[PDB]
Amino acid sequence: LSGAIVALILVIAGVIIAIAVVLFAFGLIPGISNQGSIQVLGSGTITNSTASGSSRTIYNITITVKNTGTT
Amino acid sequence: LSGAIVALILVIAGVIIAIAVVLFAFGLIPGISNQGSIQVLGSGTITNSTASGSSRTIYNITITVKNTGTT
Numbered sequence: 001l002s003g004a005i006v007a008l009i010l011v012i013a014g015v016i017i018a019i020a021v022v023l024f025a026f027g028l029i030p031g032i033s034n035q036g037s038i039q040v041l042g043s044g045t046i047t048n049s050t051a052s053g054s055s056r057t058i059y060n061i062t063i064t065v066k067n068t069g070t071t
Numbered sequence: 072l073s074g075a076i077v078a079l080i081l082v083i084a085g086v087i088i089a090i091a092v093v094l095f096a097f098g099l100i101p102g103i104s105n106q107g108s109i110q111v112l113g114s115g116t117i118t119n120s121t122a123s124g125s126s127r128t129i130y131n132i133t134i135t136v137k138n139t140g141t142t
């Protein structure tokens with residue numbers, strides 16, 4: 001008797017998990033769009049920024065950046 | 072005589088108890104078999120709900136949900 005009862009449970013669970021994975025694949029798609037939100041325009045400039053006698057070398061960097069995302 | 076009457080009682084009792092268990096197995100099917108589920112549609116969002124330098128951070132999970140079951 002036992003075998004058929006187990007088969008019925010695993011059939012119904014199989015449908016539920018399979019549908020969930022298909023919906024997840026469609027649910028990813030919006031998140032792919034954000035990967036291209038930025039671009040860098042023209043040359044930038046580096047400048048030596050560290051104070052006299054200081055241990056750390058530090059540089060100032062300046063660039064033009066355009067954001068086209070929603071955040 | 073005794074042996075055959077006892078043999079007959081245990082045949083009839085065997086039929087009764089076996090059929091009772093078969094009827095029990097058919098009685099499980101409505102509980103274990105149950106189509107439909109909650110389905111999650113598209114992307115959801117997280118938003119910061121935390122305020123006023125509070126001790127616990129709280130977030131907001133908005134998502135679209137479809138209950139295909141009967142409950």
Ligand SMILES: *[C@@H]1O[C@H](CO)[C@@H](O[C@@H]2O[C@H](CO[C@H]3O[C@H](CO)[C@@H](O)[C@H](O)[C@@H]3O)[C@@H](O[C@H]3O[C@H](CO)[C@@H](O)[C@H](O)[C@@H]3O)[C@H](O[C@@H]3O[C@H](CS(=O)(=O)O)[C@@H](O)[C@H](O)[C@H]3O)[C@H]2NC(C)=O)[C@H](O)[C@H]1NC(C)=O
Pocket residue numbers: 048049050051052053054057
């Ligand atoms: C960014 O700016 C820093 C200063 O704001 C620079 O630090 C100064 O570096 C001088 C030499 O730079 C050369 O050597 C570096 C390694 O030591 C190298 O990383 C650099 O790319 C570059 O090739 C240094 O001069 C000292 O060393 C010279 C020989 O390398 C020597 O000729 C000098 O007399 C001096 O001993 C500076 O040290 C300071 O020099 C003062 C005098 S003067 O050099 O200003 O005329 C002196 O009074 C002081 O005691 C001494 O420490 C050093 N610091 C300063 C304040 O100038 C850093 O290199 C820059 N980095 C880049 C990439 O440009």
Ligand SMILES: *[C@@H]1O[C@H](CO)[C@@H](O[C@@H]2O[C@H](CO[C@H]3O[C@H](CO)[C@@H](O)[C@H](O)[C@@H]3O)[C@@H](O[C@H]3O[C@H](CO)[C@@H](O)[C@H](O)[C@@H]3O)[C@H](O[C@@H]3O[C@H](CS(=O)(=O)O)[C@@H](O)[C@H](O)[C@H]3O)[C@H]2NC(C)=O)[C@H](O)[C@H]1NC(C)=O
Pocket residue numbers: 047048049060
């Ligand atoms: C590297 O980047 C640093 C920031 O990341 C720069 O620090 C900023 O310096 C500004 C002045 O720099 C000028 O003078 C230097 C000699 O002192 C020279 O080496 C530089 O090349 C440059 O010619 C400073 O601006 C001050 O002066 C402005 C007028 O010119 C005035 O409008 C400002 O209000 C300010 O008084 C920056 O200011 C600081 O500004 C803060 C606001 S914001 O400017 O960041 O928007 C303000 O909150 C703060 O109180 C004030 O002190 C100063 N910025 C910072 C963050 O320190 C540094 O100059 C860069 N180095 C080079 C070589 O370009």
Ligand SMILES: *[C@@H]1O[C@H](CO)[C@@H](O[C@@H]2O[C@H](CO[C@H]3O[C@H](CO)[C@@H](O)[C@H](O)[C@@H]3O)[C@@H](O[C@H]3O[C@H](CO)[C@@H](O)[C@H](O)[C@@H]3O)[C@H](O[C@@H]3O[C@H](CS(=O)(=O)O)[C@@H](O)[C@H](O)[C@H]3O)[C@H]2NC(C)=O)[C@H](O)[C@H]1NC(C)=O
Pocket residue numbers: 119121122123124125126127128
């Ligand atoms: C969601 O909102 C939350 C509440 O505004 C944010 O949690 C708070 O973050 C503050 C610092 O923010 C930055 O650094 C984070 C890493 O530490 C980073 O995740 C963030 O994206 C952001 O870049 C934090 O301020 C504390 O830390 C600062 C240094 O990072 C410091 O300057 C502050 O003085 C302070 O210590 C908040 O912490 C709480 O600050 C209270 C004072 S005030 O900041 O409100 O003025 C202080 O009284 C309290 O004891 C201390 O815990 C912190 N809040 C909490 C509850 O943890 C969170 O970053 C936001 N984003 C995400 C993705 O969760």
Ligand SMILES: *[C@@H]1O[C@H](CO)[C@@H](O[C@@H]2O[C@H](CO[C@H]3O[C@H](CO)[C@@H](O)[C@H](O)[C@@H]3O)[C@@H](O)[C@H](O[C@@H]3O[C@H](CS(=O)(=O)O)[C@@H](O)[C@H](O)[C@H]3O)[C@H]2NC(C)=O)[C@H](O)[C@H]1NC(C)=O
Pocket residue numbers: 118119120131
């Ligand atoms: C997370 O989700 C909760 C609801 O579960 C939501 O609470 C609701 O908040 C709005 C106002 O929110 C705005 O201000 C807060 C700061 O206070 C910001 O963090 C938010 O980003 C918003 O800018 C309230 O207007 C809601 O009202 C209560 O509204 C009820 C009706 S409801 O349909 O809005 O639920 C009324 O019945 C009540 O009388 C009234 O007090 C409030 N709703 C609830 C149920 O709490 C948070 O704002 C959400 N957080 C974020 C960050 O969005």
